[PDB]
């Protein structure tokens, strides 16, 4: 194990969430992954380093860096902890404009369609496909297993293209039933 450092810069809007949530962020990194943790107030970035005398898993540094990135992107902490617990979880990201060029309220309505009432549509995707979704304005992030995120993306893309939420929800119960079977 060699001395290696990772720097993950966080945007300003995630500062306050970290400060209140950081009490639960540094423990798992320092105890389970055995990393040396700082966040630089001057650069507003999170710094992780392998301790040569203590670190044993060489992948703990990158595993921690991805975990910080997930919280940086907007995922809830417990969801971000899944990255540390697991090794086969990835973040898929894309923009609505990639699917289709929507502007003005058309763009706004598409975002509403993805979220659904009270966020109802989004959680249906999350429970059906075994993933978590962060809908940051026109930017979408999906966290989960490679197959699962692929199953999550197709549904939100369908909603972007203009498929009604009800029909999409009908597809979700079908795939959810298949998921339980396998």
């Amino acid at each position: 194990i060699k001395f290696e450092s990772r720097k993950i810069m966080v945007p300003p809007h995630r500062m306050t969430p970290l400060r209140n949530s950081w009490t639960k962020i540094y423990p798992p990194l320092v105890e389970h992954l055995k990393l040396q943790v700082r966040m630089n107030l001057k650069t507003k970035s999170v710094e992780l380093r392998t301790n040569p005398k203590f670190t044993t898993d060489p992948g703990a540094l990158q595993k921690g860096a991805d975990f910080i990135k997930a919280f940086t992107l907007g995922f809830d902490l417990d969801d971000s902890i899944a990255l540390l617990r697991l090794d086969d979880l990835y973040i898929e990201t894309f923009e609505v404009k990639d699917v289709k060029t929507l502007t003005g309220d058309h763009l706004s309505r598409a975002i509403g369609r993805i979220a659904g009432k009270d966020g109802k549509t989004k959680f249906a995707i999350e429970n059906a496909t075994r993933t978590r979704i962060v809908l940051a304005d026109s930017k979408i992030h999906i966290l989960g297993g490679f197959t699962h995120i692929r199953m999550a993306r197709e549904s939100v893309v369908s909603l972007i293209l203009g498929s009604p939420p009800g029909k999409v929800y009908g597809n979700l119960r079908t795939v959810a039933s298949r998921l339980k079977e396998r």
Binding site: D76, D78, D79, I81, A82, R85, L86, L89, G119, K120, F123, A124, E126, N127, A128, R130, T131, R132, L143, G144, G145, Y169, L172, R173, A176, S177
Partner: peptide, 21 residues
């Protein structure tokens, strides 16, 4: 089958944990 549409009390790490166990 009806799919839960509200926030799952059980987190992803817990969801994958159940799959193992």
């Amino acid at each position: 089958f009806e799919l839960s549409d509200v926030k799952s009390s059980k987190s992803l790490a817990e969801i994958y944990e159940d799959d193992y166990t």
